Amino acid sequence: CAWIPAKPLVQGATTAQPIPGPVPVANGSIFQSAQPI
């Protein structure tokens, strides 16, 4: 009964890896913005 395989309520991965940031542009500014949405 308790050994029957079941699908959990929250399926899939429960964590996400951070994506490394974009390469900064060689313009002489410290402020670098990611691709805006």
Partner: protein
């Protein structure tokens, strides 16, 4: 020596650096440290870094230490070892920073990276501001920014003020001085200049371009009004149209309606407006009403 005063070079820009620090050596005019817990917290952090561990439960009431924020400008083409000026501003309930000293302060950029280290003695005027000071050569540059200068054959001169006429004048001056297709105009603010490939050649080209003389064409008529400081400034292009003006406690030097003549140059405008006998605060309302009516042939900007 006018092009260097009218434009800026693309990629040659300044950045802003910020940081937190402690200022010591005050004559009992520092933080109260009872309403500013971060002062004592960061002093304990510094002492722990230096090897002294003050027990967590202890009352520390200082008088010669103030928590301050340090601001600096990262110059173009900054190199490590170079020194820059910094501004030191108190953050909470401090009374003065007259003879203080700024301890080791890392100056972070927008990307939260250390670009300079600040440490020095504050100079405070002493009617004068007591909670703000400046340290000349107070910060040493520690990081360098990559740049694209010297790469490619195109560099953009960016005008401080947008003007198609001024852009065309700068383009024509560069073409008159350094060949046919040396400079082209992209918009009212940007002039594209062709330069030889390399670093030294582009420096030579920019050195010749920067000190060039360009005759400034007449700008747009503009009247700047500052109500917070109570000032009015009119440039040389302001003209007037004939119309009648009335305002409280102002009369002909007689009737309350005073004629204002049609004026072509700035001297005529000044004479016509001084004939009104108006205080500058009254002149602000008069000018706004005349702009609404249409006598003032200028752009009225309130700053």
């Amino acid at each position: 020596e006018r092009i260097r005063d009218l434009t800026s070079v693309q990629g040659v820009r300044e950045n802003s650096l910020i940081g937190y620090g402690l200022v010591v050596g005050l004559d009992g005019t520092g933080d109260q440290t009872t309403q500013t817990p971060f002062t004592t917290q960061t002093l304990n952090n510094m002492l722990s870094q230096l090897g002294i561990t003050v027990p967590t439960g202890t009352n520390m009431q200082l008088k010669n230490v103030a928590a301050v924020m340090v601001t600096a400008s990262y110059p173009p083409f900054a190199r490590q070892g170079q020194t820059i000026d910094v501004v030191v501003s108190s953050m909470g309930n401090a009374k003065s920073l007259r003879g203080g000293t700024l301890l080791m302060t890392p100056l972070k950029g927008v990307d939260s990276q250390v670009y300079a280290l600040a440490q020095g003695n504050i100079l405070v005027g002493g009617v004068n501001q007591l909670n703000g000071g400046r340290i000349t050569n107070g910060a040493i540059i520690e990081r360098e920014l990559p740049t694209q200068f010297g790469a490619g054959n195109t560099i953009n001169l960016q005008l401080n003020d947008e003007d198609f006429t001024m852009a065309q004048q700068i383009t024509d001056a560069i073409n008159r001085a350094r060949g046919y297709g040396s400079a082209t105009a992209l918009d009212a603010r940007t002039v594209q200049v062709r330069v030889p490939s390399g670093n030294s050649s582009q420096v030579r080209f920019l050195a010749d371009i920067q000190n060039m003389e360009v005759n400034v064409t007449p700008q747009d008529a503009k009247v700047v009004i500052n109500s917070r400081t109570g000032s009015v400034v009119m440039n040389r292009e302001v003209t007037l149209d004939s119309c009648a003006v009335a305002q409280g406690n102002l009369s002909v030097t007689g009737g309350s309606l005073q004629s204002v003549r049609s004026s072509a140059n700035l001297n005529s405008v000044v004479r016509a407006l001084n004939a009104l006998g108006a205080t500058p605060m009254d002149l602000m309302s008069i000018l706004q009403s005349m702009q609404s009516a249409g006598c003032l042939r200028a752009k009225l900007e309130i700053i």
